[PDB]
Amino acid sequence: AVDSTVYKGQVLKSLDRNDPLPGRIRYRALDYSEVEVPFGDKDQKGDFTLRHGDWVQFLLATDRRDQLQRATSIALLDETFKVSGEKREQGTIASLKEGFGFLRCVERQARLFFHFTEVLDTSREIDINDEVEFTVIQESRLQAIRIKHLPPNSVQFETLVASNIEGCVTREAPKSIKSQDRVEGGVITYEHVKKTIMYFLKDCEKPPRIGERVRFDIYMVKRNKECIAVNVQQVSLH
Ligand code: EMC
């Protein structure tokens, strides 16, 4: 039946999702010979997208009735992403439906669709707020494929890039009800090469007036490709 050694090889021919065993995997046998072995749909541990050149794990199954050896229980190896050249992005599982879900992306504004079949690890469960790494493909329909679980505290949606930066309020934030503005905001001008940066009333205690000197921290919001001034406070000693 199935051999017990964990074999390592590369995908020579991917499966066409758009011959019962059309796939091909090239590996090095224990006797240092180069071997090609076929595989089919059920030979992958999950219905995820395998690609030409992917490093994979598999077990060798011998079918005496079909008179051929087969690669089975194929799983994608993480080392592929170190040599793949594909764009790997980060995010967290935002919602879970039946068969699909949506991810909150680090570098993208919109929620990203993803099929449950693209989760690489079939040994563990998926939950909300799971930190994941994926590859985005386009078909105007976007989806995340080859989704890998990330260790805790690996995903940061915003980064502190500077602290105690000083500038001048060149457009006061709109005098605002209970809901906090997150679109209009104000404008702070600082020469830290003069630059502008947006601030919002939610990120200051006591709103600064137009033309007043302020001190603030700068955070990089990656999904918006912009920085935001927070912890805004007035400066008396200029
Ligand atoms: C230092 C006055 Hg905006």
Numbering used by the authors: 3 to 20, 28 to 148, 156 to 192, 194 to 209, 212 to 257
Sentences from the paper on this structure:
Here, we address this challenge by presenting the results of our comprehensive and systematic investigation of Upstream of N-Ras (Unr), an RBP with multiple RBDs and a model system for understanding sequence specificity of modular RBDs toward target RNAs. In Drosophila, Unr (dUnr) performs sex-specific roles during dosage compensation. Although reported to contain five ssRNA-binding cold-shock domains (CSDs), we demonstrate that Unr includes an additional four CSDs that do not bind RNA (pseudo-RBDs) but are involved in mediating RNA tertiary structure specificity by reducing the conformational heterogeneity of Unr.
The fit between experimentally observed scattering densities and back-calculated scattering densities from the crystal structure (χ of 1.02; SASBDB: SASDHJ7) strongly suggests that the fixed domain arrangement seen in the crystal structure is maintained in solution. CSD456, featuring only one canonical CSD, binds with a KD of 16 μM, comparable with the affinity of CSD1 alone (Hennig et al., 2014a). Overall, CSD456 and CSD78 mutants displayed decreased stability when compared with wild-type (WT) CSD456 and CSD78, as established by measuring melting temperatures using differential scanning fluorimetry (DSF).
